[PDB]
Symmetry: C2
Subunit: 81 residues, 2 copies
């Protein structure tokens, strides 16, 4: 479960970023020894689009900063209550 | 350098604990897929022995909490300026 451990670390890192209301979706895969991932975070519906984009960039930087093997990460957002 | 990445994570986790003045020494090895490690942290010479022991236990819990493959960790302390 070495991929499981990595996914846990991604979810835990994303959830510690201000404005994140859970990880709705995470798809991670290996390209060689590198991780490529795609994620959807929850955000307050009343945040602006610009705020949601900022939170997404913060998640990107936090997750990549903590998990060195990640070479591609996309983060999008969706309203979550 | 998959062991290097693990050692970096141990050092980074230990250094984020209050009262830690650097990791003086870290020896990590694999027993199967598990990590066993021994470390020496720096501490304020003016801390009590009891305080240094507390900081050591905090390092132990922080590091083990963040790095799941670790199954044995000993943390000792030495005065550092």
């Amino acid at each position: 479960s070495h991929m499981e451990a990595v996914q846990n670390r991604i979810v835990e890192a994303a959830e510690r970023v201000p404005g994140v209301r859970g990880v709705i979706h995470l798809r991670a895969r290996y390209v060689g020894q590198d991780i490529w991932a795609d994620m959807i975070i929850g955000v307050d519906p009343e945040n602006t689009v610009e705020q949601a984009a900022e939170i997404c960039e913060a998640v990107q930087a936090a997750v990549c900063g903590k998990i060195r093997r990640i070479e591609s990460l996309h983060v999008s957002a969706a309203a979550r209550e």
